[PDB]
Amino acid sequence: MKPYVLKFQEIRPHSEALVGGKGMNLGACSNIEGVHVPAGFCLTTEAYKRTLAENNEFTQLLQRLSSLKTSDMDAIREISETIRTLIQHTQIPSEIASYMDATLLDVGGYEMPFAVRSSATAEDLPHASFAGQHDTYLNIIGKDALLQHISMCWASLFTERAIIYRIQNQFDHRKVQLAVVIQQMISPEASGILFTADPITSNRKSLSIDASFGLGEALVSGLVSADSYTVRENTITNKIIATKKLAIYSLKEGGTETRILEKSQQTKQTLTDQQIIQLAKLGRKIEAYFGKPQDIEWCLAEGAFYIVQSRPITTLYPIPEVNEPGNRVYISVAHQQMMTDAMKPLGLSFYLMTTPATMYTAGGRLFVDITQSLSAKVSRDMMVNSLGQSDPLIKDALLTVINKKGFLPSIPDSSSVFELVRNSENSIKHLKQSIETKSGSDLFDFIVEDLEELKRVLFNPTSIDAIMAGMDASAWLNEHIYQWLGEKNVADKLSESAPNNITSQMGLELLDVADVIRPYPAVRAYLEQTKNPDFMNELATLEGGAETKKALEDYLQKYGMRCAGEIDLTKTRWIENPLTLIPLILSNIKNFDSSASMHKFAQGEKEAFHKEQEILRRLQELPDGEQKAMETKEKIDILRHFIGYREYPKYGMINRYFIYKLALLRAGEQLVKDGILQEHEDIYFLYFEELREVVRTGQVDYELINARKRDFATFEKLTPPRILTSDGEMINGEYKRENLPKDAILGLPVSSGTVEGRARVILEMEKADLEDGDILVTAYTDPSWTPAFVSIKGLVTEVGGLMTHGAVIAREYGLPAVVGVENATTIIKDGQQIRINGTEGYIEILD
Ligand SMILES: CO[C@H]1/C=C/O[C@@]2(C)Oc3c(C)c(O)c4c(O)c(c(/C=N/N5CCN(C)CC5)c(O)c4c3C2=O)NC(=O)/C(C)=C\C=C\[C@H](C)[C@H](O)[C@@H](C)[C@@H](O)[C@@H](C)[C@H](OC(C)=O)[C@@H]1C
Ligand SMILES: Nc1ncnc2c1ncn2[C@@H]1O[C@H](COP(=O)(O)OP(=O)(O)NP(=O)(O)O)[C@@H](O)[C@H]1O
Ligand SMILES: [Mg+2]
Incomplete structure (x- = not known):
């Protein structure tokens, strides 16, 4: 952590603290053969710390900034104005400028144009993204202009907007710095973005290009419009062509200007079909190098593709860790259970440890692996008809999946029930007593015997x-x-x-x-x-x-x-x-x-x-x-x-x-006393086996737990699909309005009757203030949600199926309910009068 400047060629792995995320990935990309990264270097976070973070007024100002909330808005407007103007008034130490003059001549030289690009990092969060947060200036020529724009980049760390972002994402302002990427300009015919996996579908197999004429700043800031192309295998599925009115071009003497394209040029396909496939291959080589899908910026100049940014993707729904081979299709447990909330691993594991299904996990929720069923003759074809008697969209989703790139090649006694119930009541009575004796690794040893008993009353x-x-x-x-x-x-x-x-x-x-x-x-x-x-x-x-x-x-x-x-x-x-x-x-x-x-x-x-x-x-x-x-x-x-x-x-x-x-909480609090765990409920981020080893061995991997913790966060933001694919395609079925009013929202009938009332869209039962008229529109509705069925006139959910609580509960309460409703909570607005028909399954947005 000493140098002020590093060429892309000099950057070692994990140097984010010095060069920032952008700088690091540029360094990494520049060592991939067949990948052309325009030469350049990073002005290191050292230069930033030397110039600014060592200044008493600056640090005092930032110490003040540490104190304020998003609600201290006007303190934010003014303190940040002070910081910004302070930065632009602080000259860059001549020693730093000297090191730069040398490295700049190597790439070269002060008559050539450079991009000047922010590269941020948060200390001890090397991979933290500050995407779209700070400034970049293109086509800057000369030492004076260079130094000026470095200070400008630095100052852009302290816009009101960047500050608010850090507060809301709990980044400490004192522990974020900016490196500056200084890079040879490409003067391109075309530029754009590449996503190694389609943002629709999310299928890990398609590619996607956004492409415009001219410099990339238009597409990103955020107009001009752009071309869109999808390429599935090595064949191009789709081509789209935007009417591209504007394009941004570099001026010979520095800076940038927007021009209007000729009418006949605006509708031309930015990239040829050959170039599109070439770019796709280029892009497939950088996840392949990088190992997870990526977000990549590119330039096309004189037939040559230049890579100008790469960066991990952050939105896709994870794939099950399957130990099986070939193409797999998973069914979503969330939809049948009416849950869809992300689960923690300890909780995830206990469901797995109790099911005789082939259940797997992806994104904090559970999927069932049912492909071998699908493959056989007449057991598919068992399942699709049978799974269609609980959820039509599932049946629909399966038909859609069996048409792919060959993806596919006794009533008991009256007296039965009360004995069943009391035999459970007692089995639990025993249980309640036998654990109050177990503890430590005895506890864990016992839970497993008891899982056998759980299964026994459950599956009797x-x-x-x-x-x-x-x-x-x-x-x-x-x-x-x-x-x-x-x-x-x-x-x-x-x-x-x-x-x-x-x-x-x-x-x-x-x-x-x-x-x-x-x-x-x-x-x-x-x-x-x-x-x-x-x-x-x-x-x-x-x-x-x-x-x-x-x-x-x-x-x-x-x-x-x-x-x-x-x-x-x-x-x-x-x-x-x-x-x-x-x-x-x-x-x-x-x-x-x-x-x-x-x-x-x-x-x-x-x-x-x-x-x-x-x-x-x-x-x-x-x-x-x-x-x-x-x-x-x-x-x-x-x-x-x-x-x-x-x-x-x-x-x-x-x-x-x-x-x-x-x-298990007792053991976790017992684990705190022994000094082996930080937080008593951190045992929620270990699966039940990992947890066994901890009480057993007195050892934990917190760099693991914290990642579980982190992963959990970036689930929650996900919504499981009805059906999930080995490729991570998501398939929610489509319903069939046979002769139902058009403009209706379609769902599963479940519980009979038609009714008209106020839509109340609620995600938390606690914040639900239900009144007499109301029709409850929500996401799931498991047995937990019953107490709120007593005032409402009808129910609507996003997920579920005939015969799956609390669909079953609407019937007995005599509540009309419709259930399989794509995006009910987003489609319907709280307060909209609304009509639900829970016979034919539909919803009308009454005026
Ligand atoms: C369309 O529904 C079916 C899906 C089939 O397809 C298929 C591939 O997709 C599945 C999904 C999405 C599941 O989430 C699931 C599941 O969560 C579960 C069992 C295990 N099931 N049985 C295995 C054999 N054993 C003798 C009984 C337990 C499953 O097989 C499945 C399952 C499948 O197998 N287990 C449990 O959840 C646990 C821990 C307890 C459940 C207890 C009660 C008792 C169940 O509710 C009973 C009453 C029935 O309700 C279900 C069996 C459903 O059957 C019906 C008619 O509705 C089933 C979800
Ligand atoms: N060397 C370059 N030559 C031409 N265009 C460039 C160059 N560097 C960047 N651009 C373009 O200008 C934009 C600047 O990107 P950059 O500042 O590096 O990140 P950003 O997208 O602006 N925000 P962020 O990625 O979070 O730092 C990019 O979107 C490109 O379209
Ligand atoms: Mg960028």
Whole structure:
């Protein structure tokens, strides 16, 4: 960390601290044979530190800047003006200028034009991007102009905009410096960007060129327009041709000017087809050198391609680490589970450790690998029809994938259920006791035996037979009563207020806990305005508190394990953060009168005796009439016995998960005491095996954890596709509006009825302030989301499928719901009156 200047040829690996990201990648690119990087050098961060960071006024100014927030806006406008003008007034030490004069003559010389380009780094974050944050000036000639523009580059580190960016991304201003790339200008016929993997599709196999005439500054700042071409294998899939009005050109005596292209020139294809393929190959060599897809800037001059920037890509949805060969197709677990939130590795692993599916992981969520199924004759073709009875877009997405570059070459007893339930209740009772004895590596040793027991109650053949009994029977009823009586999706109304549904009870019991809070206005005022996490220990103060805390405590002992994202072991359970239930307990205090759970439940079973006994009567004057009747009543009794249970096995699974979580946090806090972990919940970023070794060996790799931590962040920003490909193509299916109103948003019908109301688009149940009219539009809706179904008039989600909670819960609440809705939360606007049809599956944006 001594030199002031380095030629691209002199730059060693991992020198970002000295030359910045841009400078480093230019250095790297310049050593690839067949790659022409215009000669140049970096004015090092040394020069920056020497000239500026050693200045007492500068450092004082930056020490001040350290103190302010994005809300200290006018302190930002003025302090940064001071810094900027201070920089442009500070001369560059003659010693630094001397070293530069020498290196500049080597590339050469002060009569030639140079690009002067910012290159930033953040200390100890060598790969941190400052893309589009700081200045570049093109075609600068002469020592005077050079020195002037170096200071200008430096000053551009302290625009209001660059400062705000650093504050929001938690970069310390004192630990960011600017190197300056000084590089021979290319005077090009054409220039542009290259993305080694298509930003649509995201398919890791297509390439993409944006190409314009003239210098690249137009395309990037951000007009002119540009040509777009996609090349899939070595063949060109697509060509696009922009009408390119303007082009930027270098002036002989320095600087730059914009010209208007002749009309007949504006529509010409920037690059020939041969040049496009040549560029693609050029580009494939730099991920191939770099190992991950890349973002590359280029110039075409006199038939020669010049590389002028390269930089890792940052947006694509990762591919599963598959240990299989050949082309693979993955199905998304998120969509069927109604989850789609990124999961942490510890939580990711516990789901994997409990499934007999071939599940893999990509981007913090889970995929199932189902290609070998697809390949065989008549098992594909098993699956596509079968997977189409839960999710049409999946079926659609699979047809679309089997057309590629050869991508492809018993009902149990009535008494069954309560024994199933109590045999789980007890299996958990045992569990709760046996871990409070285990600890350390004994804990881990035990969890694995218990996973076997988890699997045993979860996948009990008798349980499954009881589960399907409900599904199968509403399969039968829906198919057959539409066949005879015609016009019917009947099992929706027949399922209404079904008994023993541990998840429908949950949302409906919160109605009662609010009936307890309602009388006491002391507690209601506290609860109305509180962010205190242990507000439950301040209640005994107020007149209602003691009564209230009891009401709540019992709910949490019944449902406290459950939280949104429950499948992820690492997510805060309700009982760990009771304050998240308050706005729902609050707002259905005000939306309901006394005994609302009774009246909602009753009117449901009333409104399904009527359909039962309407359908049965109405079937009597059909041809074979009282026969057809008795076989349906047979299926209704069956239906309404085993529909509750459909939701129990998840509730048993989770209870274990929360019991495991408590135990694993103990070990993690025990790991803090021993000084081996920094943060007690850092165990969320290790998979369950890695975690075993840590308690076992007393060793961790924090440069690993921190990357898990970092990776997690850049998931969350992702949204899993319905289907994922070995190439990382994403396929969400397309729906079929047969004879549905055009201009409608299409989805899966799931729960019957048409209704009109206010759209409330909510991503957090806690911030959901639902009112009587509202139609809830959200992303997923797992059992966690039930308590919010009691005031709304209809439901809309982005993801899901018939027979997958909480689609199953809408039916029993008698709620119209539509489910497979591409981009509902973005397409629909909060507050827009809206009509949902949950019979035919569509949505109309009412005026
Ligand atoms: C269209 O749905 C199917 C997808 C098929 O395709 C296919 C390739 O894609 C899948 C996706 C996307 C999954 O996410 C998945 C899954 O999460 C899971 C099992 C494991 N399944 N079984 C293996 C055999 N064992 C005897 C029972 C467990 C799976 O196979 C799959 C799965 C597939 O296999 N496991 C679990 O999640 C766990 C840890 C517990 C689940 C418990 C309850 C009990 C389940 O809900 C039961 C009630 C059924 O609901 C499911 C089996 C679905 O079946 C139906 C009719 O809906 C299935 C998601
Ligand atoms: N030597 C060069 N010759 C011709 N055009 C260049 C040269 N260097 C850069 N350009 C163009 O001018 C722009 C300047 O890019 P550069 O400042 O290096 O990064 P940036 O895209 O402006 N922002 P960033 O990448 O985060 O630093 C590029 O987008 C090119 O189109
Ligand atoms: Mg750039």
